[PDB]
Structure 1
Amino acid sequence: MREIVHIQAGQCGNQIGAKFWEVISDEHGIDPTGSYHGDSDLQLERINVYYNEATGNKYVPRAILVDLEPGTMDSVRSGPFGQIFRPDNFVFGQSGAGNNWAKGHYTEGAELVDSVLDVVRKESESCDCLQGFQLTHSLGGGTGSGMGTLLISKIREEYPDRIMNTFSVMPSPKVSDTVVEPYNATLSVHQLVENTDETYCIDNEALYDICFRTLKLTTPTYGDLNHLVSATMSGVTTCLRFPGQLNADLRKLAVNMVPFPRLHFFMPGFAPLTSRGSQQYRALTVPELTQQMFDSKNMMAACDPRHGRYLTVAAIFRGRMSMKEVDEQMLNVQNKNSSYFVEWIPNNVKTAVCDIPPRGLKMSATFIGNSTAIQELFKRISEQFTAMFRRKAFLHWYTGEGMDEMEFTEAESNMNDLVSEYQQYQDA
């Protein structure tokens, strides 16, 4: 277990995907042409997790870029790190998916999926020992959502003993493209519950509110939202990418974070919260990091941690700091809040440290929580689904592609089951 294969689908998927590669390439010393120009050995020791080595001697992301429309991917190609991607790994159709999960999953996506799997296969064949896959996508559109979940199901069929991991962007009325987002998200959640091992719930509601309430940006763009996403994504993958005292992979993450196979939707958090441009000079103390990383206002999923309990938590501290003081503060916050951590999983809070801080910071903390409070996210989507679905509003966009209302009823029931399955462990 060395190689991860990365897939990015649709507009959101490709935009957050491109930003992730910009950030991690910078962290690993890699420049737009693929050349290493860094000064630490820690940068290269585990670089094979994400990068292929061409005889070059160039580093090529193990990344496949997928869309049903060309626009966003042309934008990736002419973007900052655009030239670094293997040009054969751009797989795109022409028609788009019209924010329609049925188009992505059943009609338009079906037409393109085999050629994506061909590219997946070529990368997988070149792997010493493939860990599994990470997908970036949103759940509210058509391609990332319908076609992304189609890909996952086809990847699982061909590689049933590999790990599937997603970064899944949840829609919010606060940052909304179409009214059909809750339909697309519910259909997609149904898929994620069955076919991923671990999913980071990146909630556009939370990203918006952080940008507005905390970063004091009166009118957040997608760019501002994505600044938070890429910082979080860098953070959560630190222990996959860098050598440390705990050497992690996608399977060990899943084993230790997921006590029941359906409850695999993580609430990520980050501290210190910053924006692009105006950044703080004031350094953070270990007690301040720890306090901030656990604050509701630092979570990337709009749920109140106090309305539930943590099943498991992984925490990663980056920068030169006292590991002794880290351990003390982490233990302090558990011992002073222990009603919020289930008592039937001993040692359910795990901390790891990496010396390399992210760009522009002296120290940072990244949070990965499996909390029963995530049920709030799913309940919110469920309410929005039902508000339309009770009158069958907007359904003709889906029945026109050959779907039946039964399939909506089934995906709704499965998502409601998930919610009450969370409620079950919040009491005991």
Structure 2
Amino acid sequence: MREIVHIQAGQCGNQIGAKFWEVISDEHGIDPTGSYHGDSDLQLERINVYYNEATGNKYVPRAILVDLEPGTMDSVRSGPFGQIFRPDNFVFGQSGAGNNWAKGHYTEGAELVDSVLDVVRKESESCDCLQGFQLTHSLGGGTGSGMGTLLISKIREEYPDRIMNTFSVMPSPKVSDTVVEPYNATLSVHQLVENTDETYCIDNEALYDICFRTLKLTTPTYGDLNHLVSATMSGVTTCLRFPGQLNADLRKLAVNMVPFPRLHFFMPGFAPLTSRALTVPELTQQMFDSKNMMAACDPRHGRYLTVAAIFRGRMSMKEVDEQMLNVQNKNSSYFVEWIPNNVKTAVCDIPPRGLKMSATFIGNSTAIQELFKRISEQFTAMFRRKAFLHWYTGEGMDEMEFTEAESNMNDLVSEYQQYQDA
């Protein structure tokens, strides 16, 4: 359990992936040329989880960049850390996917997927012991959604005993590019339910609400949303990137977080929410606050199956333990009693950039069903009149596939309800 292979697909996927790589390259002391300039061996101890070592002392992200149009990947290649990526790991087409899951999954994406898998195979072949894959993508568009889920299916076929992890951005009418986003997201969720082991549900609705209400950003941009996304991703991969006892690899994380195979959709949170000194009680209180959740769900509307908490910085571990025990003991009704000791806590000494301490939250809550109910309502409002279906039937899809995707997502919601009532 060592190397992770990273894949970023589509516009959203590549932008949040580029920001993620910038953030963790800074955290590990890697400059945009791939050279290490840190001051602590803690930065290098597990560097091989995400980086290959190249000729000299160069570190190259084990990252594969995929899109069906070149624009966003040209912008990545011109970005601050653009030169750090392996040039051969850029795999792009020209047609684009036109925000069409069917184009991403069945036609345009099918034309590109084999060369993407060739790059995946080359990266895996030079892995001492591949853990699995992490994919960044959105569910509302065409390339990320459709071709990412296609890539997930193919990778599962070629690596059935490896862990599949995704960071999946859920569409929201508050921050929407097209009306067919509920179609694309509903089609994607079925694939994720069947073919991922862990999925961080990053809800654009929640990101917008945070940027507007909490960060006092009048006009949030995708950059402002991606600031939260990158901070959260750095938080949730800390246990994979630094020495530690708890959730130190993808499979142990999955075993700790997933009591039932389909219920593997995580609600992430971050504290403090930034755009100068937090105490541990404040960190804990804020990290369990709904206003800090990256999925627009009220946790007090459901129950926690499992929780992972990651504290970063130099702080009293005694006080961290006390505060986590405090939160559990004073709100025990919101933790299922049939999974004893379902809250696990990690502490890493190295804080993120700009902060002296931070806390990252990963909850498997039955309240996540509200996100899927929201998507299902927006799906049904158009599907009952077969609106905008011609974009998809023109690519070879039939209505039955939409009916089945709707059915399965309703089943997912019903399963969350069953365990919320258990």
CA contact (8 A) 2:308 2:362 kept: yes
Residue by residue over 1:44-102, the C-alpha shift from the partner in whole angstroms, topping out at 9 and shown as x without a partner, is 00000000000222000000000000000000000000000000000000000000000
CA contact (8 A) 2:247 2:256 kept: no
Distance in 1, matches of 2:40 and 2:246, equals 19
% identity of equivalent residues: 100
CA contact (8 A) 2:373 2:413 kept: yes
SS of the residue 1:378 aligns to: helix
Distance in 2, matches of 1:215 and 1:132, equals 35
CA contact (8 A) 2:28 2:38 kept: yes
Distance in 1, matches of 2:195 and 2:247, equals 25
Match of 1:149 in 2: 149
Residue by residue over 1:127-168, the C-alpha shift from the partner in whole angstroms, topping out at 9 and shown as x without a partner, is 000000000000000000000000000000000000000000
Distance in 2, matches of 1:69 and 1:25, equals 26
SS of the residue 1:114 aligns to: helix
Residue by residue over 1:89-116, the C-alpha shift from the partner in whole angstroms, topping out at 9 and shown as x without a partner, is 0000000000000000000000000000
> Structure 2 vs 1, CA of residues 425 and 50 (structure 1 numbering), >3 Å: closer, same or farther?
same
Distance in 2, matches of 1:66 and 1:77, equals 12
Match of 1:65 in 2: 65
SS of the residue 2:332 aligns to: coil
Distance in 1, matches of 2:421 and 2:279, equals 35
TM-score w.r.t. the length of structure 2 is 0.99
Distance in 1, matches of 2:332 and 2:367, equals 16
Distance in 2, matches of 1:255 and 1:392, equals 41
Distance in 1, matches of 2:54 and 2:247, equals 25
Distance in 1, matches of 2:267 and 2:247, equals 22
Distance in 2, matches of 1:407 and 1:126, equals 38
Distance in 1, matches of 2:366 and 2:227, equals 27
Distance in 1, matches of 2:199 and 2:85, equals 25
TM-score w.r.t. the length of structure 1 is 0.98
Distance in 1, matches of 2:51 and 2:73, equals 20
Displacement after TM superposition at 1:247 (Å): 6.0
Equivalent positions of 1:27-426 (< 5 A) are 27-246=27-246, 248-275=248-275, 283-426=277-420
CA contact (8 A) 2:284 2:359 kept: yes
Distance in 2, matches of 1:379 and 1:180, equals 16
Runs (4+) of structure 1 exceeding 4 A deviation are none
CA contact (8 A) 2:247 2:253 kept: no
Residue by residue over 1:190-220, the C-alpha shift from the partner in whole angstroms, topping out at 9 and shown as x without a partner, is 0000000000000000000000010010110
CA contact (8 A) 2:283 2:359 kept: yes
Residue by residue over 1:276-321, the C-alpha shift from the partner in whole angstroms, topping out at 9 and shown as x without a partner, is 9xxxxxx000000000000000000000000000000000000000
Distance in 2, matches of 1:426 and 1:387, equals 26
CA contact (8 A) 2:172 2:203 kept: yes
Residue by residue over 1:216-251, the C-alpha shift from the partner in whole angstroms, topping out at 9 and shown as x without a partner, is 101100000000000000000000000124361000
Residue by residue over 1:365-418, the C-alpha shift from the partner in whole angstroms, topping out at 9 and shown as x without a partner, is 000000000000000000000000000000000000000000000000000000
SS of the residue 2:355 aligns to: coil
Distance in 2, matches of 1:152 and 1:255, equals 20
Displacement after TM superposition at 1:22 (Å): 0.1
> Structure 2 vs 1, CA of residues 218 and 345 (structure 1 numbering), >3 Å: closer, same or farther?
same
Distance in 1, matches of 2:262 and 2:205, equals 23
SS of the residue 2:334 aligns to: coil
More deviation, 313-322/247-256: 247-256
SS of the residue 1:15 aligns to: helix
In the alignment, structure 1 segments of 5+ residues that lack a partner are: 277-282
In the alignment, structure 2 segments of 5+ residues that lack a partner are: none
Residue by residue over 1:262-288, the C-alpha shift from the partner in whole angstroms, topping out at 9 and shown as x without a partner, is 000000000000119xxxxxx000000
> Structure 2 vs 1, CA of residues 254 and 168 (structure 1 numbering), >3 Å: closer, same or farther?
same
SS of the residue 2:385 aligns to: coil
> Structure 2 vs 1, CA of residues 245 and 163 (structure 1 numbering), >3 Å: closer, same or farther?
closer
SS of the residue 1:339 aligns to: helix
Distance in 2, matches of 1:41 and 1:56, equals 18
Match of 1:280 in 2: none
Q: How many residues align?
A: 422
SS of the residue 2:53 aligns to: strand
Distance in 2, matches of 1:412 and 1:338, equals 34
CA contact (8 A) 2:246 2:345 kept: no
Distance in 1, matches of 2:41 and 2:126, equals 24
Distance in 1, matches of 2:124 and 2:339, equals 36
SS of the residue 2:406 aligns to: helix
Distance in 1, matches of 2:273 and 2:128, equals 38
Distance in 2, matches of 1:139 and 1:110, equals 17
Residue by residue over 1:327-378, the C-alpha shift from the partner in whole angstroms, topping out at 9 and shown as x without a partner, is 0000000000000000010110000000000000000000000000000000
Residue by residue over 1:164-190, the C-alpha shift from the partner in whole angstroms, topping out at 9 and shown as x without a partner, is 000000000000000000000000000
